[PDB]
Design a protein around this ligand. Structure first.
Ligand SMILES: CC(C)(COP(=O)([O-])OP(=O)([O-])OC[C@H]1O[C@@H](n2cnc3c(N)ncnc32)[C@H](O)[C@@H]1OP(=O)([O-])[O-])[C@@H](O)C(=O)NCCC(=O)NCCSC(=O)C[C@@](C)(O)CC(=O)[O-]
Ligand SMILES: CC(C)(COP(=O)([O-])OP(=O)([O-])OC[C@H]1O[C@@H](n2cnc3c(N)ncnc32)[C@H](O)[C@@H]1OP(=O)([O-])[O-])[C@@H](O)C(=O)NCCC(=O)NCCSC(=O)C[C@@](C)(O)CC(=O)[O-]
Lengths: 422, 381
């Protein structure tokens, strides 16, 4: 069964189409049809001073092809056109072969800040020359069930200049599937007393870093010009303008901020659905956006003129998880993982990275062609046309006559739908 | 000050007791209090209007951060977060800072920046001089396509052109528009799209895009607190060391981007919580603020904590772009978002921006105080 015409289906028809796809078990489908929410007693366990619950929309972005595997992505967003834009971009890019994505590394970085170090140079080399014992110390409670390529893998000391000067020790630990810093804090808590003794300094803090450069993930798409425009040869011009738009985000931070914001309309939507910490992802990615000395766009769009293809690519820190937190407490988050086929943490990271590039593509394509206002008043005319009882074959001629008028309401679509039937 | 029911021991109250205490405060109307007691949620029919392909609704916790004193006015702040200890830390930090006199905050400006990128300009210098010398007609043009914002005190205020070098060269026109209580995305892009045809003619170039910018440097807001050392520790003699170590933690975030990211992440645990509660766009705030953190060439912490040794006080300060809104979006559609604005006394957009700016510094304060003293090992309650 295809997702064609899913645009124009009603809420009840969307749930029947999802049931036809057979993506959810009987229990999860029923849970979704009752619109089961996280209970107040559960929310009382996740947060403090809880006095109720707050609800947001829950949507589906279909036909997300990542590495030859197709997914139905769950979105949680309150902003109109975000889901429609990701769905439109996902369909086009699926026709172009889908996304290719990889996880370069998956390790979390912890750091211990030391200060009041008499000689940072000798302390740097003294701690460095005990790297083996320091990592052996950090690995002593995880000798084999973790020490199979996981565990504390690397350590190094660096002199960070400034006011004052800090001696920072970075530890690199294999994260596994859970969002548990229990691994990290066990290694940090034991290294702090030793690092103080080796450096003859004082420890300021031992904390995880959300600048997760040991968890980079890249996704890419390759779109033939013929897929960008129905017109003859104008798919190349749209491609040229999308590559220019990507260079603008590299040149002006005022554009980079908006460029990267559009990326995170989708990334945060799937991060919320899957119960992931979007503040950590937003921080690491936006810090990553200025790694070359200036805040620039997080994705690149270039032209392959000889193959006649538009190429998109984006690398971000994406240390997402599939266990822990609200994943096992929020029943709709568990349903979101089931919906995606229970992907691994690395597989989920490549799906999120792909929808962010898909979200970015739909924004740039609209900005450089029709504009972003046009696409905002076509979805209203569409939703108002469905509330007026229009069939699928008559939505399009009703939207053209509604969008023709400056202002239209439900009473406007109803009168026009009646003339269409007269 | 007494004669007003206090929030002491609110941590230890049960869910039903929290609603009774909130009812005793008399902050919500009979309808809003009842709406909260029924735990009224946004319906699927309403959510159907906010998003596409809606197949249900997604629920998050909804919490209260009490005793948020901003500019001598006290508030009960609503939080929507799924992360444990976030609400507890913001409540704890707000109580201490309330004892220290609360927050002082200001709004420097409240204008949105839109931009039109031009390329293929034969003479960018002459095109720059042609567009600049017609600022008056261009901004009158920008206000003629959105007349309703002019009738309420707002609209396009300033314009300027910039030559951005590179490959290729861009000629970018920035407009500064007064949005009033709205975030003004629909407003701005409507004005930009109307300027695009004219700017093409003035420059004899091609328009690439006309779009709002989330780098809202015309909407900076800073909040600050001033905490005597005696308030930093219950021992009333260890507050100096706690103060010194929080200032060191604040400078670590200025020196190491690996710390700055975590430092700024803790800020937005609270900022995003109140942005969701009030129906505001946290993606826009996250993007502009994190871009703002690298304005001096390196990604650094967004807040400053310094020592006033002669006054024996810890000083905190944070400036962020905060172009929040009180009308539009899901405001007035999500019944809990309208309840959140009522709970805060229906503050103006500028007053709301100073509450959000203050709670972000309060969140940052509680994190630094813990990392530098007990540490954040698990903190499971
Ligand atoms: C929104 C569209 C797709 C409308 O464009 P359209 O012409 O109305 O599309 P369509 O209705 O003719 O159908 C084409 C396909 O698009 C999908 N689709 C189309 N409509 C719907 C719908 N109601 N609900 C669900 N899916 C929809 C859907 O897959 C559909 O296929 P179908 O199902 O018919 O076989 C287009 O105008 C667009 O891509 N706009 C871009 C909006 C965007 O990218 N992001 C929204 C956030 S706005 C923002 O501020 C971010 C930004 C833009 O600033 C970032 C930046 O500046 O870089
Ligand atoms: C958590 C406390 C307050 C406990 O520390 P404590 O002193 O043992 O708590 P307490 O019960 O003794 O103090 C009571 C008061 O504190 C608040 N409070 C205290 N407990 C609760 C509770 N269960 N529920 C609701 N409110 C609570 C509340 O205001 C309460 O007022 P009262 O009811 O007594 O009148 C303290 O240790 C703390 O502030 N820790 C900071 C933890 C934190 O910042 N969490 C945020 C998420 S972690 C994060 O952001 C990542 C990070 C930190 O790396 C970012 C960064 O690096 O900056």
């Amino acid at each position: 069964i295809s997702w064609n015409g899913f645009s124009k289906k009603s809420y009840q028809e969307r749930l029947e189409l999802l049931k036809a796809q057979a993506l959810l078990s009987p229990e999860r489908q029923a849970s979704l049809e009752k619109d089961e929410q996280m209970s107040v007693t559960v929310a009382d366990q996740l947060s403090e001073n809880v006095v109720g619950t707050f609800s947001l929309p829950y949507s589906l972005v279909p036909e997300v092809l990542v590495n030859g595997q197709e997914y139905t992505v769950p979105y949680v967003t309150e902003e109109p056109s975000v889901v429609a834009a990701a769905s439109y971009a996902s369909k086009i890019i699926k026709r172009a072969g889908g996304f290719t994505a990889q996880v370069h590394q998956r390790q979390m970085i912890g750091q211990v800040a030391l200060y009041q170090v008499a000689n940072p140079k000798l302390a740097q080399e003294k701690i460095a020359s005990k790297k083996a014992e320091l990592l052996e110390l950090a690995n002593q409670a995880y000798p084999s069930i973790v020490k199979r390529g996981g565990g504390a893998r690397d350590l190094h000391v660096e002199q960070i200049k400034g006011e004052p000067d800090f001696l920072v020790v970075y530890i690199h630990v294999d994260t596994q599937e859970a969002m548990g810093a229990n691994m990290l804090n066990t290694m940090l808590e034991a290294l702090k007393p030793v690092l103080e003794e080796l450096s003859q300094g004082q420890s300021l803090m031992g904390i995880l870093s959300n600048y997760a450069t040991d968890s980079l993930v890249t996704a890419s798409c390759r779109i033939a010009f013929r897929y960008l425009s129905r017109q003859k040869d104008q798919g190349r011009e749209i491609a040229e303008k999308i590559a220019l738009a990507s260079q603008f985000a590299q040149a002006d931070p005022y554009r980079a901020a908006t460029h990267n914001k559009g990326i995170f309309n989708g990334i945060d939507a799937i991060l919320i659905a899957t119960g992931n910490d979007w503040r950590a992802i937003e921080a690491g990615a936006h810090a990553f956006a200025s790694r070359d000395g200036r805040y620039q766009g997080l994705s690149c769009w270039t032209l392959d003129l000889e193959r006649e293809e538009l190429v998109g690519e984006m690398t971000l820190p994406m240390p997402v998880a599939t266990k822990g937190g609200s994943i096992g407490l929020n029943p709709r988050v568990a349903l979101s993982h089931d919906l995606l086929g229970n992907p691994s943490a690395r597989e989920l990271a490549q799906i999120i990275e792909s929808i962010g590039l898909a979200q970015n593509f739909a924004a740039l394509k609209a900005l450089v062609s029709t504009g972003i206002q046009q696409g905002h008043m076509k979805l209203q005319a569409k939703s108002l046309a469905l509330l007026a009882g229009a069939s699928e074959s008559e939505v399009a001629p009703l939207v053209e006559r509604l969008i023709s008028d400056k202002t239209f309401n439900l009473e406007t679509a109803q009168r026009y739908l009646e003339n269409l039937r007269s």
